[PDB]
RNA sequence: AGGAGUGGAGCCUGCGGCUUAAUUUGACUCAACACGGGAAACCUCACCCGGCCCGGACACGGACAGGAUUGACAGAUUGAUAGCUCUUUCUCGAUUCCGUGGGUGGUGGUGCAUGGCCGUUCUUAGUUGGUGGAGCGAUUUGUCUGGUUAAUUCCGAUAACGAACGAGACUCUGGCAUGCUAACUAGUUACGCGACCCCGGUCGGCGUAACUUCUUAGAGGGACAAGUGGCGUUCAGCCACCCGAGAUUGAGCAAUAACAGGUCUGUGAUGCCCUUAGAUGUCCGGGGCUGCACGCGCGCUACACUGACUGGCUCAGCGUGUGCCUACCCUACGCCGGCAGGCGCGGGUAACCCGUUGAACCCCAUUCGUGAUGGGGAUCGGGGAUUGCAAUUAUUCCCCAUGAACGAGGAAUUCCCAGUAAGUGCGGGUCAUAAGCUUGCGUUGAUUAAGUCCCUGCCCUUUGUACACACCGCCCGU
RNA sequence: AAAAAAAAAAAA
């Protein structure tokens, strides 16, 4: 069955359980404070979050 | 909330970083008053800057 | 395209004719006489028949095998 | 495109009540979150609305991970023709 | 997400910015746009269906959001609105030099 | 002048080369080589071998409910209970099958088409108008002979005055106000009770009258070369000293102009090329990115007695902590086991619970005795636990055996002026299992110097030019 | 028996 063989690798764990919420790429993720979103889009939209240049 | 990320989107160049923080200040006042004054305080002075939460023990 | 490895063709279901006229038996009387046993389950309807194999009759969407 | 009939007319009647829906881009998701009352997919849903895009009844915006669809008045009269309703009930977007 | 949504939506309607306000049962948001007659659409249809989109996508109890419309003062003193103005001018197809001098003269006549 | 070193030995990682069906590719002096947040068991994946599904939206033309096709069963069949085929069609009823255009998709090629982002020139101190003056004009002065500072930072010589950018100026943290405004989610002091010793002593033992003295954090100020003496056009400014908390704490942004610098492998940022059902898309299974005569670069451990081992004493701060998709949170207490670990038992959506975070180093008392040794723990065998569907090409840890090289490393080369280097330990990212990497925190805490242009680079003035695509230039003769 | 051709083509 294709419909039962289509989900044979569970995504309970591993790097495949999450992806970027903007560019949808599975690299450079930020799991800290539940951002779940890649670093380059983090730099692009960091000013809109409220994140500031202070240090 | 300190988050340190890189600078280069690629992997070429000088190894430089960047720093992100906020200042988050917490204030509480305890009051020996009935709930009607609490609802009047909640209804009055509504601004998008600071949120109001009330609890009773 | 045609590569080194030959491609197995898909299941071409041959168009059979007079199949819907092959369910019941035509006689002088108007009564019905089907050659396929009925489906007593609730997954497939009362008008749903079985298959006609050599040894055992098989459901459709029920995917249930009733042996003898 | 071996997709059933009753789920699509359920999508169409929930479209006729309100002409906008949202759907996240996830092929590996067997259940719609808002339409949890009955078993519906998501990939067949977004393929149906991009077929409506190919027909020219809605317009498409994709922001981060969600596809966005907007109902037109020509799409409204297409819904009236397909569902065969008399012109006396209107989707709630036009109402006050 | 809301800022990127409204930036993608009101590309040609002169989007300037939005403000977010939090209030129980009155979670209202106000969009500031240069073209007031085009954000509403036809008798305020467009603002209500954008309200429906953000209501059914973000997720609230219904009736808890009331979007408003307002025209921002000093339209020339907004760098964003001049950027979509320049994009609207150059998408039709003109010379970059004369359009750049026109927008520079508009900024200098705006009081900057 | 020094300190720590690297390069030497073993070990981890990357690159080249070789090998491989595949060992995927970018990145080759600063300005690539523990880089892509790239610690790859499966997804990652872009690489190889293998098999299905369409995710061909669709416009037209052949077919239409009488059937256009998916979903499967004794059994050959890989790899699977993918019917993918083959025995058999009821089952889905117009959702469609086929030919052409068209469309979609691509971690496919092109960063030398690019946008955007970042690095480098350079964080050096360097640019530019207005007016006036000189020159027929291009142009020049303002921007400078000189003195000073980290600084085109100032003084001053002076057809130059008046201004801007960069630096400074600005922001954040620390240094302290026994002042001010306030703390039962932080405590202090008095009083009462309780426990022990001999009349007083200790209690982070218990409870309730004031308070900010610790901590916490708001408003303010202090520091400005303020004063004295010396040097100096007695100017700018520098040095020594006194009172005073501090007489140079550190970080962010960082001007004009420019690189054929890197990123189409961050993006549904994107032009062109190639391909698209028998797929350079997608799904699933296995293997491979790790592979080994060899060469290079980041790092870890030691080459011992200023040390190793065994017990006791005693000291912190950044932090983090139960999830939309999601299910992976931090733990005290009480038993079992040497141990890693196993089972119950509460707290915390957080100054309350972990936690007074009883950290390491160091200190005290033995053992060791210059011997590749009780240093060093590479290599190797067996057993036992947890995570996960799966640990072989050891995931990780624990226990016992195994004890190699290594006696302070040639040429060469890197980083560094005060809580600094260095020796330690603790957090965050990586994370189902998880640090030899990186970013921070904290303990202890130095030697040397207040300079130079010798080396190595950068910048400026003058000078010469037959150069202006500008020495990678122009140009002579056989 | 190997080459590279340097020119970007107003100032609405
Ligand atoms: Zn049946």
Swiss-Prot record, chain A:
The modification N6-acetyllysine is found at residue 47. One of its GO terms (biological process) is cytoplasmic translation. Keywords: Acetylation, Cytoplasm, Endoplasmic reticulum, Metal-binding, Methylation, Phosphoprotein, Ribonucleoprotein, Ribosomal protein, Zinc. Zn(2+) binds at residues 20, 23, 38, 41. It comes from the Eukaryota. Its cofactor is Zn(2+). It is found in: Cytoplasm, Cytosol; Cytoplasm; Rough endoplasmic reticulum. GO terms for molecular function: structural constituent of ribosome; zinc ion binding. Belongs to the universal ribosomal protein uS14 family. This is Small ribosomal subunit protein uS14. It comes from Oryctolagus cuniculus (Rabbit). The gene is RPS29.
From Swiss-Prot, chain B:
The modification N6-acetyllysine is found at residue 15. One of its GO terms (cellular component) is cytosolic ribosome. Keywords: Acetylation, Cytoplasm, Isopeptide bond, Phosphoprotein, Ribonucleoprotein, Ribosomal protein, Ubl conjugation. Polyubiquitinated by ZNF598 via 'Lys-63'-linked ubiquitin chains when a ribosome has stalled, initiating the ribosome quality control (RQC) pathway to degrade the potentially detrimental aberrant nascent polypeptide. Deubiquitinated by OTUD3 and USP21, antagonizing ZNF598 activity. The keyword Phosphoprotein applies. Component of the 40S small ribosomal subunit. This is Small ribosomal subunit protein uS10. It comes from Oryctolagus cuniculus (Rabbit).
Curated annotation (Swiss-Prot), chain C:
Monoubiquitinated at Lys-25 and Lys-31 by RNF25 in response to ribosome collisions (ribosome stalling): ubiquitination promotes subsequent activation of RNF14, leading to EEF1A1 ubiquitination and degradation and rescue of stalled ribosomes. Deubiquitination at Lys-31 by USP16 is required for maturation of the 40S ribosomal complex. A zinc finger (C4-type) spans 39-62. The modification N6-acetyllysine is found at residues 22, 31. There is a cross-link at residues 25, 31 (Glycyl lysine isopeptide (Lys-Gly) (interchain with G-Cter in ubiquitin)). It comes from the Eukaryota. It is found in: Cytoplasm; Nucleus, Nucleolus. Component of the 40S subunit of the ribosome. Part of the small subunit (SSU) processome, first precursor of the small eukaryotic ribosomal subunit. During the assembly of the SSU processome in the nucleolus, many ribosome biogenesis factors, an RNA chaperone and ribosomal proteins associate with the nascent pre-rRNA and work in concert to generate RNA folding, modifications, rearrangements and cleavage as well as targeted degradation of pre-ribosomal RNA by the RNA exosome. Part of the 40S ribosomal subunit. Part of the small subunit (SSU) processome, composed of more than 70 proteins and the RNA chaperone small nucleolar RNA (snoRNA) U3. This is Small ribosomal subunit protein eS31. The lineage of its organism: Eukaryota, Metazoa, Chordata, Craniata, Vertebrata. The chain holds residues 83 to 150 of 156 of the full protein.
From Swiss-Prot, chain E:
The gene is RPS3. The chain holds residues 20 to 131 of 243 of the full protein. There is a cross-link at residue 71 (Glycyl lysine isopeptide (Lys-Gly) (interchain with G-Cter in ubiquitin)). It is found in: Cytoplasm; Nucleus; Nucleus, Nucleolus; Mitochondrion inner membrane. It comes from Oryctolagus cuniculus. Methylation by PRMT1 is required for import into the nucleolus and for ribosome assembly. It comes from the Eukaryota. The modification N6-acetyllysine is found at residue 43. The modification Asymmetric dimethylarginine is found at residues 45-46, 48. The modification Phosphothreonine is found at residues 23, 51. Component of the 40S small ribosomal subunit. Identified in a IGF2BP1-dependent mRNP granule complex containing untranslated mRNAs. Interacts with HNRPD. Interacts with PRMT1; the interaction methylates RPS3. Interacts with SUMO1; the interaction sumoylates RPS3. Interacts with UBC9. Interacts with CDK1; the interaction phosphorylates RPS3. Interacts with PRKCD; the interaction phosphorylates RPS3. Interacts with PKB/AKT; the interaction phosphorylates RPS3. Residues 2-73 form the KH type-2 domain. Belongs to the universal ribosomal protein uS3 family. The modification Phosphoserine is found at residues 16, 85. This is Small ribosomal subunit protein uS3.
């Amino acid at each position: 069955g294709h419909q039962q063989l289509y989900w044979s690798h569970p995504r309970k764990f591993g790097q495949g359980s999450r992806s970027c919420r903007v560019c949808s790429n599975r690299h450079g993720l930020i799991r800290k404070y539940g951002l779940n979103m890649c670093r380059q889009c983090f730099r692009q939209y960091a000013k809109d979050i409220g994140f500031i240049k202070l240090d | 909330l300190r988050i340190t990320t890189r600078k280069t989107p690629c992997g070429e160049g000088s190894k430089t970083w960047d720093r992100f923080q906020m200042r988050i200040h917490k204030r509480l006042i305890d009051l020996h008053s009935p709930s009607e004054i609490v609802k009047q305080i909640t209804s009055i002075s509504i601004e998008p800057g600071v949120e109001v939460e009330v609890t009773i023990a | 395209k045609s590569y080194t490895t030959p491609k197995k063709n898909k299941h071409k279901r041959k168009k059979v004719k007079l199949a819907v006229l092959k369910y019941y038996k035509v006689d002088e009387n108007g009564k019905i006489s089907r050659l396929r046993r009925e489906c007593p389950s609730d997954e497939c309807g009362a008008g749903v028949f079985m298959a006609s194999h050599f040894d055992r009759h098989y459901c459709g969407k029920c995917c249930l095998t009733y042996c003898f | 495109m071996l997709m059933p009939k009753k789920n699509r007319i359920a999508i169409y009647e929930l479209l006729f009540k309100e002409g906008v829906m949202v759907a996240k881009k996830d092929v590996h998701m067997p259940k719609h979150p808002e339409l949890a009352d009955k078993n519906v997919p998501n990939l067949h849903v977004m393929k149906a609305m991009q077929s409506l895009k190919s027909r020219g009844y809605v317009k498409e915006q994709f922001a981060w991970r969600h596809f966005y669809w907007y109902l037109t008045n020509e799409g409204i009269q297409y819904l009236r023709d397909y569902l065969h309703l008399p012109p006396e009930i209107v989707p709630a977007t036009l109402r006050r | 997400e809301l800022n990127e949504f409204l930036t993608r939506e009101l590309a040609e309607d002169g989007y300037s910015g939005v403000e977010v306000r939090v209030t129980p049962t009155r979670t209202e948001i106000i969009i500031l746009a240069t073209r007031t007659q085009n954000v509403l659409g036809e008798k305020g249809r467009r603002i209500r269906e954008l309200t429906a989109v953000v209501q059914k996508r973000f997720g609230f109890p219904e009736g808890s959001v009331e979007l408003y419309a307002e025209k921002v003062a000093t339209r020339g003193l907004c760098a964003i609105a001049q950027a979509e103005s320049l994009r609207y001018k150059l998408l039709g197809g003109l010379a970059v030099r004369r359009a750049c001098y026109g927008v520079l003269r508009f900024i200098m006549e705006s009081g900057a």
